[PDB]
C-alpha cells in the first residue's frame, strides 16, 4: 500500500516538492535508458557524483528559490539540448552539471526574481567561473532560444549552422495559447510516464501521482 496524491491541472497550483520528485524520476528514467542502450562535453563529470539527482534538485530549489515554471523549463531544456547539441546525451555523467546550468538559465532568462551566478555556483557546488562558462556554453549551443514555445525546438534546429548538401533537404497566429503550451505538455507527460511508483528512484518519495482525466 502506497499514498495516492491527485495533482491539479495547473502545475503552478501544485507543490514544487512534487515537481522536484516528478522531474527527478523522469531524469533517472532517461539516464537508465540512454545508457543501457566518446567526445566529452562541458556537462561531463569525471565520475558520477555521490549525490542522487533528487537530493541535488531539491537543494537547488530550496536555496535558490526556483520558481515552478523554471522547474518545468529545466526538464524541457534536456529535449532542447539533446536535439541541437549532437554530442550531448543525458546520462549519469551529465545530469548534475546540465541541471545546475539549465535551472540557472531558465531563471535568469524567463523570470523577474533571480540570483547571481556566484550565488548559484555556491549552492550547486561548483566554482563561480565553472558555472559562467557552463552557462555560456549552453547559450551558444541553444542560440539563446530559451523561451519554451511550441515551435521553439524546430526554430532552434533550423537556426543551427547548416551543412551544404547537394540536394536541399525539404507566425504563431491562431495557435492556442499563442504557442505557450509546452510546459503543460511536459507536466502531463511526466505524470503519465513516471507518475506511478515504477520508474527507478523509488528511494526518493513513496507516492503514486494522478492527474484527472481531462
Amino acid at each position: 500500500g502506497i499514498p495516492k496524491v491527485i495533482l491539479p491541472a495547473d502545475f503552478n497550483k501544485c507543490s514544487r516538492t512534487d515537481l522536484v520528485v516528478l522531474i527527478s524520476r523522469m531524469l533517472v528514467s532517461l539516464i537508465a535508458i540512454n545508457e543501457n542502450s566518446i567526445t566529452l562535453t562541458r556537462y561531463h563529470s569525471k565520475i558520477p557524483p555521490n549525490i542522487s539527482i533528487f537530493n541535488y534538485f531539491i537543494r537547488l530549489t530550496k536555496f535558490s528559490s526556483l520558481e515552478h515554471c523554471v522547474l518545468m523549463t529545466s526538464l524541457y531544456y534536456i529535449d532542447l539540448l539533446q536535439t541541437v547539441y549532437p554530442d550531448f546525451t543525458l546520462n549519469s555523467l551529465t545530469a548534475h552539471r546540465f541541471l545546475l546550468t539549465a535551472t540557472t538559465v531558465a531563471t535568469k532568462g524567463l523570470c523577474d526574481s533571480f540570483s547571481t551566478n556566484a550565488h548559484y555556483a555556491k549552492v550547486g557546488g561548483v566554482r563561480c567561473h565553472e558555472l559562467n562558462i557552463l552557462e555560456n556554453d549552453f547559450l551558444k549551443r541553444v542560440n539563446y532560444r530559451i523561451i519554451p514555445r511550441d515551435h521553439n525546438i524546430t526554430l532552434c534546429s533550423i537556426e543551427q549552422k547548416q551543412k551544404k548538401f547537394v540536394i536541399d533537404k525539404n507566425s504563431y497566429v491562431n495557435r492556442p495559447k499563442s504557442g505557450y503550451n509546452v510546459l503543460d505538455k511536459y507536466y502531463r507527460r511526466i505524470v503519465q510516464l513516471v507518475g506511478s511508483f515504477n520508474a527507478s528512484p523509488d528511494k526518493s518519495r513513496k507516492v503514486d501521482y494522478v492527474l484527472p482525466p481531462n
Binding site: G109, S113, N117, C128, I147
Partner: protein
C-alpha cells in the same frame, strides 16, 4: 564590423555605430559588459525575446558576437524624445497620428505573442531617417506567456508608469503598455510630459490631480493593491481637453479625445487594448 561613433550609454551597455563588411548596411553595435553575475540576465532576456519579435515596427537584432558580448541592432537615427527636442512644441497632428499608429502596430504584435515591453518611453521609440517608428530596448520586457511571479523593476523615470503598477500591483497584464501609449500621445500632442513626477509618491498624486482619484466603485480590484490608500482626499477627474488644448496649436477633435481617454483609464480592465486601439474611429481614414 568597424565601429564609427558612440551613441548612448548605461550601466549595462555601451552602444556604438558600425558597418557591415559585405552590404554597406549601417548597424548599431551594443556592447554588453561580460563577472559574478555571469552573462547579464538583461542580455539573455533581450537576445531571447528579440529573436521572437520580427516586425516592421520593432528594431531588429541582426546577430550576436562573442570576454564580451556585442548585440548587433538595426541602426536607427534618433528617437521620439530626441526628434521632438529638434523642433524646440508638440508635433503636427497628422504626424502625431502616424507615429502613434506605428507604435501601437509594433506593440500590438508584442502583446499578440504574449510579451510586455514594460518600459515604453520616447527614448525607446526610435525613428530612422525615413520616418519609421520602431520599439526598442526590450531589456525589461518579459514573455508573460510564461506564468512566473512578477516583480517590477527600478526605472530611471516614472512618467510613463501605470498608476496601479506604482501601487505595487504584481498581477498586471498587457495593460501596462497601453498607459505609456496614452502618455506618449499627450506628449506628442502638447510638447511637455503629462505626468512629470519626481518619485513614487508624486507621480501618483500627479495622475490623480488630472484623472481623478481611483473610483473604488467601478474598479473594486484597487482595494487589493499593496500600496493602496483608502484615506486619500478624493478628487474629481479633470477633463483632459482643458489640460491639453491650451498647449496645442491645433483644435483637438472628439475622436482624438475619446481615443485618449480610452488609453488613460485608471482601471486596467477599462484600458483599451492595442488591437482595439488600432480600430478606433480616430484611425478610420487608415482603412
Amino acid at each position: 564590423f568597424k565601429q564609427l561613433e558612440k551613441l548612448g550609454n548605461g550601466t549595462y551597455a555601451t552602444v556604438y555605430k558600425g558597418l557591415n563588411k559585405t552590404t554597406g548596411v549601417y548597424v548599431a553595435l551594443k556592447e554588453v559588459k561580460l563577472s559574478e553575475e555571469g552573462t547579464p540576465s538583461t542580455a539573455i532576456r533581450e537576445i531571447s525575446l528579440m529573436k521572437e519579435l520580427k516586425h516592421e515596427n520593432i528594431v531588429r537584432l541582426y546577430d550576436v558576437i562573442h570576454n564580451k558580448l556585442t548585440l548587433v541592432f538595426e541602426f536607427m537615427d534618433n528617437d521620439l524624445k530626441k526628434y521632438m527636442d529638434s523642433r524646440t512644441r508638440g508635433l503636427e497632428l497628422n504626424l502625431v497620428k502616424y507615429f502613434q499608429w506605428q507604435l501601437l502596430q509594433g506593440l500590438a504584435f508584442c502583446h499578440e505573442n504574449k510579451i510586455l515591453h514594460r518600459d515604453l518611453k520616447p527614448q525607446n521609440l526610435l525613428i530612422n531617417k525615413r520616418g519609421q517608428l520602431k520599439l526598442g530596448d526590450f531589456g525589461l520586457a518579459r514573455a508573460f506567456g510564461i506564468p512566473v511571479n512578477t516583480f517590477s523593476s527600478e526605472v530611471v523615470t516614472l512618467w510613463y508608469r501605470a498608476p496601479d503598477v506604482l501601487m505595487g500591483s504584481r498581477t498586471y497584464s498587457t495593460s501596462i503598455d497601453i498607459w505609456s501609449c496614452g502618455c506618449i500621445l499627450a506628449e506628442m500632442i502638447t510638447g511637455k510630459p503629462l505626468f512629470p513626477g519626481t518619485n513614487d509618491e508624486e507621480q501618483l498624486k500627479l495622475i490623480f490631480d488630472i484623472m481623478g482619484t481611483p473610483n473604488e466603485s467601478l474598479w473594486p480590484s484597487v482595494t487589493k493593491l499593496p500600496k493602496y490608500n483608502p484615506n486619500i482626499q478624493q478628487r474629481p477627474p479633470r477633463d483632459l481637453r482643458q489640460v491639453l488644448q491650451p498647449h496645442t496649436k491645433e483644435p483637438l477633435d472628439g475622436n482624438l479625445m475619446d481615443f485618449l481617454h480610452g488609453l488613460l483609464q485608471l482601471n486596467p480592465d477599462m484600458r483599451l487594448s492595442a488591437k482595439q486601439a488600432l480600430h478606433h474611429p480616430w484611425f478610420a481614414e487608415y482603412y
